[PDB]
């Protein structure tokens, strides 16, 4: 079987992408943030404390004929930007883009932190890292992708994220119209539960490619590109009004500037980020300064190839028993 769904940016700065997911019978449609940096599918629901809900669309398990309570199972997660939620657990039918899994664990939030209530566009998360990071206890639950692997035509999914535009997640086949050239695959380590890989090096603008190993994660649920301090400082040295701003929390530059492209290595292949994709946008509406899309990972403690990078490429998460990651230009 296969599925394909449209993923849309939630705002004009592509802060995050949402995708329609049908949960329940009859189907309740919620727009979920597909996150390769965690492994919990959880939703706002009729369980969630009332003053912590607004904007969002909730799932109501009592109106789904196929929902079962998973007795005794509770979950609690927190993310890299400090947000968090917890609750209990049902199984129920979940479909993406025509592709249906029965028995999937749908985590019901009893409580959500303040950034989730304030974000009206995102109704939940669908996690697509490896199932060892799942948070349900006592027994951890498999992700949507792990549960669909049995019925998929191949055990892959692809992310094709658009630059101020919609894009596509596909499951189970590779759309050879959606990219150019050939895809290059590189090994993934699953040690930490992420789609973790090693970049072979980087270039700035039309300058030289430096071969140096950058271990990092491919994470659809992080906005920016976060790389080692000395790499990000070589980037912004080429932008004459860029400086590191403590107040703002990163490198800022005048919005009028034309930025250089950034190239990162995959194997022998090279992926080039256009400079326009690194201009994240004005620091406030009508400002002359804009925030940069490449920033340091030093306080994070891991390198993140977030949406700034993955949207310049067509990327294949290859979920075979030995996983790999594929990138092609587009
Ligand atoms: C340095 S890692 C930080 C990362 N968060 C992000 O990257 C959020 C994403 C967001 C977008 C729109 C609205 C709300 C949140 N953006 C963000 O912090 N930005 C700050 C700087 O300007 C760009 C936007 C991350 O924590 N996200 C979670 C996924 C989940 C969180 C809740 C909302 C739905 C997405 C996950 O990807 C994660 O923890 O990765 C870990 C492994 C580092």
């Amino acid at each position: 079987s296969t599925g394909s769904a449209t993923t849309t940016p939630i705002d004009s700065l592509d802060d995050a992408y949402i995708t329609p997911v049908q949960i329940g019978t009859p189907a309740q449609t919620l727009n979920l943030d597909f996150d390769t940096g965690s492994s919990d599918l959880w939703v706002f629901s009729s369980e969630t404390t009332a003053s912590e809900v607004d904007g969002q669309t909730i799932y109501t398990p009592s109106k789904s004929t196929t929902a079962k309570l998973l007795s005794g199972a509770t979950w609690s997660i927190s993310y890299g930007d400090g947000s968090s939620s917890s609750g209990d657990v049902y199984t129920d039918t979940v479909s993406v883009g025509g592709l249906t899994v029965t028995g999937q664990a749908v985590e019901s939030a009893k409580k959500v932190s303040s950034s989730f209530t304030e974000d009206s566009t995102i109704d939940g998360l669908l996690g697509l890292a490896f199932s060892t990071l799942n948070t349900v206890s006592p027994t951890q639950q498999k992700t949507f992708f792990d549960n669909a692997k049995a019925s998929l035509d191949s055990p892959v999914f692809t992310a094709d994220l658009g630059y101020h535009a919609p894009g596509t997640y596909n499951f189970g086949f590779i759309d050879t119209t959606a990219y150019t050239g050939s895809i290059t695959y590189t090994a993934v380590s699953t040690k930490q539960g992420f789609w973790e890989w090693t970049s072979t090096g980087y270039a700035v603008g039309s300058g030289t490619f430096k071969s140096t190993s950058i271990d990092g994660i491919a994470d659809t649920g992080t906005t920016l590109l976060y790389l080692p301090a000395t790499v990000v400082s070589a980037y912004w040295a080429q932008v004459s009004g860029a400086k590191s701003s403590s107040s703002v929390g990163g490198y800022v530059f005048p919005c009028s500037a034309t930025l250089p492209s950034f190239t990162f290595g995959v194997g022998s292949a090279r992926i080039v980020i256009p400079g326009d994709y690194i201009d994240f946008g004005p620091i406030s509406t009508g400002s002359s300064s804009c925030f940069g899309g490449i920033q340091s990972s030093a306080g994070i403690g891991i390198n993140i190839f977030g949406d700034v990078a993955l949207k310049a490429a067509f990327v294949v998460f290859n979920g075979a028993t030995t996983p790999t990651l594929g990138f092609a230009s587009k």
Side-chain angles (χ1 to χ4, degrees):
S1 68
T2 65
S4 182
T6 298
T7 181
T8 64
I10 57 168
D11 64 21
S12 62
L13 306 172
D14 293 351
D15 270 309
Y17 303 72
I18 44 170
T19 304
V21 178
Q22 276 78 222
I23 300 165
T25 306
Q28 286 179 58
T29 291
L30 273 68
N31 285 143
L32 294 183
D33 191 337
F34 284 22
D35 182 26
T36 62
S38 72
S39 301
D40 291 47
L41 184 168
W42 73 261
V43 293
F44 276 85
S45 83
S46 54
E47 309 180 327
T48 296
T49 290
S51 56
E52 289 177 1
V53 179
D54 72 57
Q56 297 82 2
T57 294
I58 55 168
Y59 171 54
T60 292
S62 67
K63 285 290 97 133
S64 172
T65 55
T66 39
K68 291 199 281 181
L69 180 74
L70 197 59
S71 324
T74 52
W75 53 284
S76 178
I77 190 163
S78 65
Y79 291 110
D81 52 26
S83 54
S84 69
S85 40
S86 62
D88 56 21
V89 194
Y90 294 80
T91 60
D92 199 340
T93 295
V94 169
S95 307
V96 173
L99 171 63
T100 294
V101 165
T102 59
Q104 168 67 221
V106 178
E107 307 169 40
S108 179
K110 292 191 171 221
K111 295 180 283 191
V112 293
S113 52
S114 288
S115 65
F116 281 124
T117 302
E118 282 155 20
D119 185 6
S120 74
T121 67
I122 280 182
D123 294 331
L125 269 64
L126 191 132
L128 286 172
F130 287 90
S131 289
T132 189
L133 301 178
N134 175 85
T135 79
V136 173
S137 191
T139 292
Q140 287 179 127
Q141 293 303 123
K142 277 187 192 210
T143 57
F144 180 87
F145 179 43
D146 273 353
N147 290 136
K149 288 188 198 167
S151 70
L152 295 172
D153 298 0
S154 217
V156 297
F157 59 96
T158 62
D160 180 5
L161 297 184
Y163 169 60
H164 305 308
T168 301
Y169 280 102
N170 295 153
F171 287 87
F173 74 100
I174 297 165
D175 186 348
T176 64
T177 71
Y179 55 97
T180 59
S182 59
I183 289 171
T184 291
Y185 284 100
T186 187
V188 169
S189 170
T190 58
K191 262 190 106 259
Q192 295 175 258
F194 303 122
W195 285 99
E196 186 167 3
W197 61 294
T198 298
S199 185
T200 44
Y202 65 96
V204 182
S206 58
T208 46
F209 181 89
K210 268 121 181 159
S211 182
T212 172
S213 273
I214 304 174
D215 181 273
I217 69 168
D219 194 348
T220 68
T222 284
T223 302
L224 299 176
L225 178 42
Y226 282 100
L227 291 177
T230 61
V231 174
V232 164
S233 176
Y235 184 82
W236 291 105
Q238 300 299 311
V239 179
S240 53
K243 59 183 197 156
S244 188
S245 172
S246 330
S247 52
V248 181
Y251 283 104
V252 305
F253 62 96
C255 290
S256 50
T258 287
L259 291 162
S261 65
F262 182 86
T263 296
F264 57 90
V266 187
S268 47
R270 311 263 177 264
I271 305 269
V272 174
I273 310 171
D276 269 2
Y277 286 24
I278 298 157
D279 168 0
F280 197 69
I283 278 150
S284 164
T285 279
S287 181
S288 73
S289 295
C290 268
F291 185 69
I294 298 181
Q295 290 289 355
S296 180
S297 64
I300 293 167
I302 41 201
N303 303 127
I304 317 167
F305 289 85
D307 289 342
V308 163
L310 295 181
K311 67 184 153 181
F314 176 72
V315 174
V316 178
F317 293 81
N318 176 36
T321 295
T322 296
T324 54
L325 211 38
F327 291 89
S329 293
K330 79 194 180 182

